[PDB]
Structure formats: C-alpha cells, structure tokens
C-alpha cells in the first residue's frame, strides 16, 4: 500500500473544459491530465514495450496499464495549498481546424490561464514491485508540462510516504461521493482521457475576498479516517 506524492511549482496551467472561443480552464487539474503525465513519463523512460507504432495507441495502453495499477479510476487527488486565481489573455490562436476558410485565416481569439504558486498531486498505487517502483519514482518527475504546452510545470519534490492511518480534516481533492455523506463545490473533470467517464466531483476550495479577485483557499471539509503527513502538517485523504 503505497502513495506517490509530488509537488509541482508552475506559473500556469491552461487545461480547460469543452468550450468554444474561451476554453474554460479547470478550477483544479483533471484526473485525466494527471494520468497522462505519468503515462508520458513511463513511455519516455522505458520504450521497450510501452511504446508502439501508434503514439495514440501507446499512450492509451499506458493509461490502461496505469489505471489497472490504480486502486480506482477516480484515484489521483490534488491539494490547492497555494491560492488559485484566473487571468485572461488575448492570443492569436488561429482557428484553422474549421472545415473551410483555407489556411491563411487569422482569427484573434481569447483564452484564460490559471495562476497558482504550487500544487501537490498524489498517485495511489497498490503493492507495486520495487523493480517497477524505482521506474515509477523516476517517472514521478520529468513532468515538464501540464495541459497546454505553454503551461510549464516543474516538480521539485517527489516521494513515497505511507498514510499511516492518521486522522485529519480532508485536504486533498475527492469525488463528490463521501462529501455528500459527510461552500460546497460541484464539478466535472472528465475522469479518463477521451479517445476515438464523467462523474460528479467535489472541489475543496472556498472563497475568501481580501483583495480584488476573491480567489480560493482551504474550505477544510470534515475529518476523515485517512491522512498523510508532510513536513509536520497532516492533510486528509480518502481512498476506496
């Protein structure tokens, strides 16, 4: 029973919903992007068998393997320790994917990014063997980008720390299943990547307007049976 925990320090992340013109950025990074990150890491480290002729097929099979290793499909969780704010940028973003209008068209479009000092993400695994545990620890880092390419991400620390069955208020994100069982946020973040499913997610951020933008901070949901300790601070977490 092991859980990877890696903290990423990034300027922005621009992963967004299904939307036109504006790509409505997620309030917190989705499980699908988090799974794809270590899928890319593992296919980069060992292309001996995880890399196939089709890049899409190789990524999809890596995702299948990593989700088979996950205790549940809704496993990865994030910690919004730093404040979450949103800003809007006008980007050239030529929209030539439309059927027609040649290729010399320039539609000035507009997008928004999410600013946050840093985040922590958890990868819960079951009884992974050391011969692959070292490889997965190596793949924990090398997560250079999350979502949009311009949204660089830098993992500074990554480690394997056991929950030890501590008691603390919930801090990590969790699906909206036990929170209903016991300022409440409801979202949908596309659990698995879509390739040629969606479940109600509780979002652990609340509003505190001290400045112009209200941004978000800890809502401190109730106490949970499982918790994780990092640098002297204990944070709640739920697993199936």
């Amino acid at each position: 029973m092991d859980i990877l925990l890696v903290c990423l320090r990034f300027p922005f992340f621009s992963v967004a919903k299904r939307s036109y013109q504006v790509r409505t950025s997620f309030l917190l990074p989705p499980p699908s992007a988090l799974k794809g990150a270590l899928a890319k890491g593992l296919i980069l480290l060992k292309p001996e068998k995880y890399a196939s002729s089709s890049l899409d097929e190789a990524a999809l099979k890596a995702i299948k393997e990593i989700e088979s290793k996950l205790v549940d499909i809704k496993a990865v969780s994030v910690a919004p320790l730093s404040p979450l704010i949103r800003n809007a940028f006008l980007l050239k973003r030529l929209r030539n994917l439309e059927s027609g209008s040649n290729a010399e068209k320039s539609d000035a479009m507009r997008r928004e990014y999410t600013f946050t000092r840093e985040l922590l993400v958890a990868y819960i695994f079951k009884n992974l063997t050391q011969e692959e545990k070292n490889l997965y620890l190596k793949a924990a880092m090398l997560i250079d980008v999350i979502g949009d390419t311009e949204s660089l991400a830098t993992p500074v620390w990554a480690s394997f720390v056991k929950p030890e069955d501590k008691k603390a208020p919930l801090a990590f994100s969790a699906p909206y299943t036990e929170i209903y069982s016991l300022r409440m946020y409801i979202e949908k973040m596309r659990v698995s990547p879509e390739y040629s499913q969606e479940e109600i997610f509780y979002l652990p951020i609340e509003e505190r307007r001290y400045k112009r933008i209200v941004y978000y901070a800890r809502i401190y949901p109730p106490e949970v049976e499982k918790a994780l300790t990092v640098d002297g601070e204990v944070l709640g977490i739920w697993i199936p």
Binding site: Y20, Q21, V22, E98, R183, Y185, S196, R209, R212, I213
Partner: protein, 333 residues
Amino acid sequence: FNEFKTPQIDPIFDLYVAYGYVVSLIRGGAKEATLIPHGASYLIQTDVSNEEFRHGLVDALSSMLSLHIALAKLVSDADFSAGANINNVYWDSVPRNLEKLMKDLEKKRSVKGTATIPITLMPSAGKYMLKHFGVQGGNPIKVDLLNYALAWVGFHYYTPYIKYAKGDTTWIHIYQIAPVEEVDMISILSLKDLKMHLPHYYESNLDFLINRRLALLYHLLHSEALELFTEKEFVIHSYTLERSGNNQAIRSFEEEEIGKLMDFLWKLKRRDFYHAIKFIDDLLKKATEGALALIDAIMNERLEGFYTALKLGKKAGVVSSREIVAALEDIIC
C-alpha cells in the same frame, strides 16, 4: 421546501437561469426564499410549488412580450430583442421562442423541444466545438426551452448592459452580478433596481462608453439603488460584443470585482452631490486618460493614480472642489 435543482451547463448561463428563478418566483409570491451558490450550480431553496412558479414565469414573460410589441417578423429595440442580440436573425428568433414558451405554458403543458443558446446569454458557447480533430456542423450546444426563456427573463430584469453605436459598428458591454455566499429576497430586489431599460446611449460626445470599465463606472455613477455589498460579498462577470465590419466576436473576458469601486464612490460622495456627479462626468468626458488613471487607481490602490487623474482633470476643464479632495484624502487613510 421546493429546493429546486438547477441544471449544470455554464456558470454564466447557470447564473442567468438560477437567477431568473427568483424573478419568476416573486411575481407569484414565494416568500422566505434563498439562493445558495455552489460555484456554478447556484441552487435555490424556496417553499413554492410548481404552479405558482409557472404563474410567476408566465406573468414575467407576458410583461416581456407586452414590452416587445410596443416597438416593431417584428423587431423591437429591446434588451432581449435587439439591445443585446448581436445577431440579426436572433432579433426575430428570441421573441418567437418566448411566445411559443407562453403558448405552451398557459395551457398547463410542458415543453417538448430544445433550442440553440446565443452567445449573449453565455459567452462560453458559440457555433462550433472541437471534438477530436475538428468541429461539428451547426451548433452542438442546445438547451431546454423553459431554461432558455427563464434565463432570458433573468438577464432582462436584472443584469445591466450598455450599447454604443459609433457608426456602422457597435460595442455592447454585458455585465452579470453574482453572489458567492448567501442572498435573500431583499438583496435580489436591490440588485434588480440596478437594471435600467433601453440603454441605447449612442451619441458622439459620450464616446467613452468604449473601455468597458469606464462605461460601467459611468453607469454606476448614476445608480443609487443601495450600498448592499458593503456587508455582502459579490463579484461581477463582464464581456463585450463587437460589430467591426459585420464581424461579431467577443474580445474581452477579464473578471475583477465590483464591491470596492462603488465603495470608494460611495465614500467619495458624502460631502455633496452638486460637485460630485458633475466632477465625475466632467473627468470622464474631458480627461478620458485621466479617467482611465482614476479607474486604475481605484482598481489597484496606487497613490499616483489619484494625483494623475486630478492633474488631467484640472488641466482641461475640471473645477476639483475642496470637499472632493478631502474625501479622497480620507479614502487614502
């Protein structure tokens, strides 16, 4: 309690529908009601049954159609007809949808179809949608008829909007006021008082309606409903619509707040109005750069902004009376 659920589509469209819920409720009654925000769901708790809800909604849309028929396939210069409908075909499409909703509604019959939502009620929507490697023909996004009509009613009764012509093109600034914690009936009616009908400002001397922040500052200058949000937290979501050479698109989506600006205005106007309203109007009309400096100073609390705004105003035509200076100094603290 009804605790009527609200569909999750878009925290802008969801705001409109769950916030026209209350205007549909008030005309039928439904006292002791509250609106709990859930980030985007915006659930509402009320002790109302469905029939009074329907009577209130049909009364609201009956007043809506009565206003629509007052001007004229009938196209009226109304907020829901031509003031906010940037597309010419929607000018006729929206009233027909509203009257179909009525005709289905007075005969105790539920709707059976769906309709496409314009970009006016939700800037997040549009024509196309990127599925895997391309877009779909037509408009993939569609909503229920009742939700569409009730969101239109909520937009028309509460949310302010300002249009400016400037020849062939047209700027339309649309604002929505959003709570995040808790509201009751009285608060929502105070917000309703903000809405002003037929803001067809046009004209040439009033050219500072571009720079949307300046336009909303001008609108809030002449709005004196209540200073409600000095005790309750609120946010504003704004967007713009353009007619540059018959090319309609959205080119601004910045999301800052509204509380501190009007708080500074309200602490700014204790001393008198005869030298306050004309002060702001003169600085807006004459020193547009000075007005921009002033609004930046209000937004980001920088000392030099007030001095620059005052200097620009005094240079051209502003009297800059003493009491306004004292109020500004007291704001500085």
